[PDB]
UniProtKB/Swiss-Prot annotation, chain A:
<dbReference type="GO" id="GO:0016234">
    <property type="term" value="C:inclusion body"/>
</dbReference>
<dbReference type="GO" id="GO:0061547">
    <property type="term" value="F:glycogen synthase activity, transferring glucose-1-phosphate"/>
</dbReference>
<feature type="binding site">
    <location>
        <position position="490"/>
    </location>
    <ligand>
        <name>UDP</name>
    </ligand>
</feature>
<feature type="binding site">
    <location>
        <position position="488"/>
    </location>
    <ligand>
        <name>UDP-alpha-D-glucose</name>
    </ligand>
</feature>
<keyword id="KW-0328">Glycosyltransferase</keyword>
<dbReference type="GO" id="GO:0005829">
    <property type="term" value="C:cytosol"/>
</dbReference>
<feature type="binding site">
    <location>
        <position position="190"/>
    </location>
    <ligand>
        <name>UDP-alpha-D-glucose</name>
    </ligand>
</feature>
<comment type="pathway">
    <text>Glycan biosynthesis; glycogen biosynthesis.</text>
</comment>
<feature type="binding site">
    <location>
        <position position="18"/>
    </location>
    <ligand>
        <name>UDP</name>
    </ligand>
</feature>
From Swiss-Prot, chain B:
<keyword id="KW-0597">Phosphoprotein</keyword>
<dbReference type="GO" id="GO:0005737">
    <property type="term" value="C:cytoplasm"/>
</dbReference>
<keyword id="KW-0225">Disease variant</keyword>
<feature type="binding site">
    <location>
        <position position="216"/>
    </location>
    <ligand>
        <name>UDP-alpha-D-glucose</name>
    </ligand>
</feature>
<protein>
    <recommendedName>
        <fullName>Glycogenin-1</fullName>
        <ecNumber>2.4.1.186</ecNumber>
    </recommendedName>
</protein>
<dbReference type="GO" id="GO:0016020">
    <property type="term" value="C:membrane"/>
</dbReference>
<feature type="binding site">
    <location>
        <position position="105"/>
    </location>
    <ligand>
        <name>UDP</name>
    </ligand>
</feature>
<feature type="glycosylation site" description="O-linked (Glc...) tyrosine">
    <location>
        <position position="196"/>
    </location>
</feature>
<feature type="binding site">
    <location>
        <position position="13"/>
    </location>
    <ligand>
        <name>UDP</name>
    </ligand>
</feature>
Length: 601, 267, 601, 127, 127
């Protein structure tokens, strides 16, 4: 299992530019892959001016061979840069520019047609950019091998569809570098889910070519499928993604390589309490005048990520919340559920009502502190003299008025708003429409209160200036009934933090947890079987899960949280590093096996 | 890869969608590294808004009739400024640190990514009053604050021209005197009326044109193109047709790289 | 001003070893003299193992001339070390060792007798060691001049009688050195002030030779007088010291060079915080005899070494008794608390003082806990919208904590006058006088005396307050000293905002009178002990104290602020001018022809 | 502008605190701080972002407040005519604050008396 | 020992503040801090004194308060016998604090409750 001369080149579009979740993967994969491949770890990625300055420190070639390669690339009208990414593990990064497209039209693109019988439309920016990137990466590695003493082992790891043009060319040009292609998501899968009525069950039935063409995404699909076929070893992020790949790409994944995260997120039980307090303050503010709910018994449930109603199955969560509301109403419970939908949308600034409510909370707190301070002084002075406090006279007329204004400001008025920010389209918002239909309107009688925050929670924001990680830590439970999630970045973060998280068979993180944990429920990660159940039955299943959590004893919930903190190791790169190392070793074995052959783990 | 920066443009109907399609195509032809984000009013048909969805990265939707829209209150004060208030939503695009706004009746002749070098409200000296900035092409930086201030000005004092140019000129009066770097060369927003009104300069400095701006009542899409002759319907003197290349280069780009996209999506 | 080829050598006994106040002067003079003489600033001083270990960096000679000089001396049976003193301004220090040259003490003493006819007795260490230091410094200067072929002009500013041997020898060797001597306090003065009934007026009457002989300090005297006579420029710390010098050392000071203090001691916020801390100490110390209004209460303090005669604490104590009588007989809300922070033989904090501070802690804790509980209950009540029921807010649980707190406060015995139980109580001058004066901190008394026998420190359990912070809190500082050559303590007070009463016999007082026409306005009151009798001076102090007491809040604020403006007069920036004159006058007096060596005045 | 000043001050504080800890830790072992090693890669990124925020090529505005009526303003018209546009070359920079200085205001949150005390000179060429 | 810790902390704060100012000035100009120029000559003398302070040859004490009778103390006698003198080589260092822990004390200002909470483990073997 020794890579004497192997050089690792992880080619991805998000190497220095944070376009998507892939970027987090690479930024996090870099440390562990750093150790295994030493200084032979090179990241090939697009040049972004903003990215390069903030994240990358420019460097000179470590290898005279590399210097030749860099110079040759610089010479022939290309503006490749080399530097050290300042992320953990300090990897050497070759950031080539996709702005050097001197001959790309009808020369690079022309070549691609002859080689792979594939064409890219003029209109697509991402595909056009990928052909530039792919051709440049193929050139770079080919030139490196030629100019350097020939290394039979160089391993190029392509980590997305748009980096896959390079893999197609590399194998086609008969260059000896081993190629691994990894699809963090299936391109056709995203469009087919939601776009079609029943994507999951009809997987086999779908004529992929027809569907891809219909969506004017055919070129992108062809590139993804071509890369899959081309790679000696093909990897997928999750077992669910593997099932999609088997039918959509018509290729079984050779190996399934799960994504991982850092363990650096965190007695250290302060955070659940400190964060809950901050959350509790917002709730008090938002619901002012309807504060008959016990605020220690209240439980906070949240769904986060990007805004996708179908994909993140917000509808399932909302329907399940309505059923939970019914259950809590019919059987009287001191506990109240507050559901936070922290899904980003286009909205105006904080609604008048929400902002006013927070302001009233601030006023009440300020009044309480001032009167408290005055009581403090008068009590201390009274005690010092050696006399009883005389509580009746301790509060002066001046404070009595300030408090009277305070109690007036906290007038019950109308029912508290469901959405913190007024939406650009409130009428049509998929969430708001459902909330209204389902009957959750934050009524006094309702035991379930829904607060939709359409902006990613951030420190800069005036109301709830809490960073996503801190908010997540404060909430009791996180519900992510995902339909299409290829890998649940959001649920994964929650579990590493120790928040118990609902996941689904359809989510990659969910499938991963089922495979790795004999009982999901016991360890605090609930699995909803959305793949083998109907939509309504799944909703009923979620209601059962939510209700079970609600009816958990205080002590039981504490135990559940502590159990989740053990499941972080399953998602840590240390453990998950095994799977990719396997993929790399398999690549070397698949083609030119003579130099290095390793038997299967 | 420059996800941080964008060319923006406004389509208020299908007619100005054809303009935007040509502008967008021209930016692609000259190989911009920057995202082309259009803004479409509700008025653009679903079928057209799929074509705009292919060529332009993000068809952010701005409607000033919806009561949820940030400009709706302003519109009720100034019902004549619907188009203007829609355009001013360009400042709401806070996902971008800097943008170049370009009206849909502009056409790019060379790479202008260097416009991103210039700072807030750097715009060409307007032909006519050369102390106002032709709001056809202006580098600008998105901001909720700036946007709200612009709406306030729209409500309070409105616009002298009852248009984007007036509302922007009043708010950014500093351009005329403060800095010369904010002045963009006229070649970055070349109004054709300049080629017609002052032909001699065009003869000398016209070759270097980087952006042509089709002014006057008869927009580029309105013309008739016989591809066989490659000649536009020739009226009596029209400013656009002082140069038989700038408009020809509009029509060609349309025919080559849009009619294909249009036919596919059912126009 | 032609100092290009002048070398400044400030020979002193306290160059590294903090024997005394002189040490603070040098450590503070070093920065300003540093600018004037550049790298030609050398602080020849005695060598202490502790000194070099902690405060002296060891470095090589900057100029070759000295490398030979140090080497010759190092090779001749003597030890000399060169280093940078690590105090501000980094003054290069040549530390002669007065232990290593012990071998030649008998030789040195022989030479002294022929040269200056000043024998030093075998018994005295302070002088025997000073003779060693003086001879070694003369040697260093002689060697420097010899080994430096382009001969510079050297100005050696000896700063005490301990360095005085050097000046005597240097003048006799006829080395081309401009020698300045400085008497920071006349030697005879310290013995005469305590010893004699009326030291100040009989200055003319006293025969120095007779008096010194009687005190068996004659040799030490003879050396100091010899240095003054020999020195080209003789300077003194203050005008009062100059009067002593004229009649005792017998050579009038050419210039008066005041010992200024670097203003790194440096506001109203700090004053308030310090006053609060002081108020909390008072609350604690009085332990339920807190019948006075603390807002009206004024704090007066006297600090320094525990010298009853020298710091004239008797005047302050008598004057406090008179202030008590005046305040009580007249209408007084205002109460004076006098803090005598003077070092004594303390055993441990007295039972009552420790217990008293603990009850302040208990009452503060009890009040804080009840305050916090009321605050939470108030906030909860306001959130509901109900105005708080005052009676309901304090629980039975609280009324037990507060009841215990009130039960602790009760005391019968008047609060102690001294915070620390003294090893020897009867002998203590302060306590004897407090008893005689009648200030037992009785309820009726308007003047309460708290004698803190330990220098206030952060380490102290009762009060973790540094002298500086305590000073910043007190309203006025009373220093009616009899024999202060330069009151360091009053100067510190003035540099801090604090108005300070000083005597016409103190350096700081005389200096302020000389420099400001109307002393009173600026907050420095000058009690005149010089021409007044003791009792009349006490009456004068009572008048000053009473005047300060009978000052409205706003007027007092003005007084303190005017004091801050008097900081600049004390700072070395301004005060450096007086020594710079002394050096220039020394350079002018000797080798007059060379360079621009002529005196402006 | 004021926000960027705040950011830079906050950043300097964050880096300062981290230097504080590293200096204290280094001193505790008995070694003078190794200056290059004091600053971690994490801060180099924070500081790089901070110096990126500072970058501007546009001269600071001559007024502090967005004026409801700009073109009419006599002061602004004169500033433009006079040629004081706060250019890099100019030794005289004019800042017009059209609101009575107030504690509530975010910028210069000092009342008139305090602002007056801070200025070196007051020019009142009253007619 | 506690005083030297105070001195080192104070030196850190003085240098840290000075770095703070210089960094803030440098960041405002738009240049990354020049390492090796941040620290002034005075700051070196401050830190050099501090490094001189944090030097000991004697092994650190095993008993925070001085004992009335050191020989008599059973704990101290055993600390010697067992071979725990808190040498550099020793991985187990024993700190016998004879006074009941209190908030007032300069060393270990924590009250018994807070010190208990801080410790990782409480070994209470009892006959």
């Amino acid at each position: 299992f020794d890579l004497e001369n192997a050089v690792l080149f992880e080619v991805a579009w998000e190497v220095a530019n944070k376009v998507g979740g892939i970027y987090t993967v690479l930024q996090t994969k870099a440390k562990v892959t750093g150790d295994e491949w030493g200084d032979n770890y090179f990241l090939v990625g697009p040049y972004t001016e903003q990215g390069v300055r903030t994240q990358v420190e420019l460097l000179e070639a470590p290898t005279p061979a590399l210097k030749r390669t860099l110079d040759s690339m610089n010479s022939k009208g290309c503006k490749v840069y080399f530097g050290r990414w300042l992320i953990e593990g300090g990897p050497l990064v070759v950031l080539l520019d996709v702005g050097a497209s001197a001959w790309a039209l009808e020369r690079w693109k022309g070549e691609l047609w002859d080689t792979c019988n594939i064409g890219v439309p003029w209109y697509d920016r991402e595909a056009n950019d990928a052909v530039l990137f792919g051709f440049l990466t193929t050139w770079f590695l080919g030139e490196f091998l030629a100019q350097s003493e020939e290394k039979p082992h160089v391993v190029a790891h392509f980590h997305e569809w748009l980096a896959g043009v390079g893999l197609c060319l590399c194998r086609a040009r008969r260059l000896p570098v081993a190629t691994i292609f990894t699809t963090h998501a299936t391109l056709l899968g995203r469009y087919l889910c939601a776009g079609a009525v029943d994507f999951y069950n009809n997987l086999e039935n779908f004529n992929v070519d027809k569907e891809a063409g219909e969506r004017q995404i055919y070129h992108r699909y062809c590139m993804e499928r071509a890369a899959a076929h081309c790679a000696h070893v093909f990897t997928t992020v999750s077992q669910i993604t593997a099932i999609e790949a088997q039918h959509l790409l018509k290729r079984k994944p050779d190996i399934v390589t799960p994504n991982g995260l850092n363990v650096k997120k965190f007695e250290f039980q302060n955070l659940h309490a400190q964060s809950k307090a901050r959350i509790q303050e917002f709730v008090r503010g938002h619901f002012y005048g309807h504060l008959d709910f016990n605020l220690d018994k209240t439980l906070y449930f949240f769904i986060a990520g990007r805004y996708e109603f179908s994909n993140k199955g917000a509808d399932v969560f909302l329907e399940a919340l309505a059923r939970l509301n019914y259950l809590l109403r019919v059987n009287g419970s001191e506990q109240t559920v507050v559901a936070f939908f922290i899904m980003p949308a286009r909205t105006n600034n904080f609604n008048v009502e929400t902002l006013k409510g927070q302001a009233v909370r601030k006023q009440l707190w300020d009044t309480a502190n001032t009167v408290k301070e005055k009581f403090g002084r008068k009590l201390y002075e009274s005690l010092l003299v050696g006399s009883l406090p005389d509580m009746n006279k301790m509060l002066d007329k001046e404070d009595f008025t300030m408090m009277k204004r305070a109690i007036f400001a906290t007038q019950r008025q109308s029912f508290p708003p469901v959405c913190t920010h007024n939406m650009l389209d409130d009428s049509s918002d998929p969430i708001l429409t459902t909330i209204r239909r389902i009957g959750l309107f934050n009524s006094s009688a309702d035991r379930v209160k829904v607060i939709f925050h359409p902006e990613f929670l951030s420190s800069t924001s005036p109301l709830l200036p809490v960073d996503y990680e801190e908010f997540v830590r404060g909430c009791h439970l996180g519900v992510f009934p995902s339909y299409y999630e290829p890998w649940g970045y959001t649920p994964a973060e929650c579990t590493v933090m120790g928040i118990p998280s609902i996941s689904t068979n359809l989510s990659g993180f969910g499938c991963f947890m089922e495979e790795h944990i004999a009982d999901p429920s016991a360890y605090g990660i609930y699995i909803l079987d959305r793949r083998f159940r109907s939509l309504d039955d799944s909703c009923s299943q979620l209601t059962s899960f939510l209700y079970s959590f609600c009816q958990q004893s205080r002590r039981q919930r504490i135990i559940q949280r502590n159990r989740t903190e053990r499941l972080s190791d399953l998602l840590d790169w240390k453990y998950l590093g095994r799977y990719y190392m396997s993929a790399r070793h398999m690549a070397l074995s698949k083609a030119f096996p003579e130099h290095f052959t390793y038997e299967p783990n | 890869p420059m996800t941080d920066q964008a060319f923006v443009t406004l389509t208020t109907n299908d007619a100005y969608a054809k303009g935007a399609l040509v502008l967008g195509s021209s930016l692609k032809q000259h190989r911009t590294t920057r995202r082309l984000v259009v803004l479409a009013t509700p008025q653009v048909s679903d079928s057209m808004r799929k074509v705009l969805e292919t060529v332009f990265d993000e068809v952010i939707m701005v409607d000033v009739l919806d009561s949820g829209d940030s400009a709706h209150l302003t519109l009720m004060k100034r019902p004549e400024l619907g188009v203007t208030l829609t355009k001013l939503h360009c400042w709401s695009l806070t996902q971008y640190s800097k943008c170049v706004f370009m009206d849909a009746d502009t056409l790019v002749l060379a790479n202008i990514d260097d416009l991103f070098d210039r700072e807030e409200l750097s715009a060409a000296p307007d032909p006519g009053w050369p102390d106002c900035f032709n709001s056809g092409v202006f580098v600008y930086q998105p901001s909720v604050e700036t946007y709200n201030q612009l709406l306030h000005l729209a409500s309070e004092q409105g616009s002298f021209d009852g248009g984007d140019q007036g509302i922007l000129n009043t708010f950014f009066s500093s351009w005329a005197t403060t800095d010369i770097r904010k002045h963009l060369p006229f070649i970055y927003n070349l109004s054709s009326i300049s080629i017609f009104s002052y032909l001699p300069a065009f003869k000398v400095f016209g070759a270097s044109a980087k952006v042509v701006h089709f002014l006057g009542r008869v927009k580029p899409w309105n013309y008739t193109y016989d591809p066989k002759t490659k000649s536009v319907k020739s009226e009596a003197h029209d400013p656009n047709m002082t140069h038989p290349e700038f408009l020809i280069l509009w029509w060609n780009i349309f025919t080559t790289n849009v009619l294909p996209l249009l036919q596919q999506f059912g126009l």
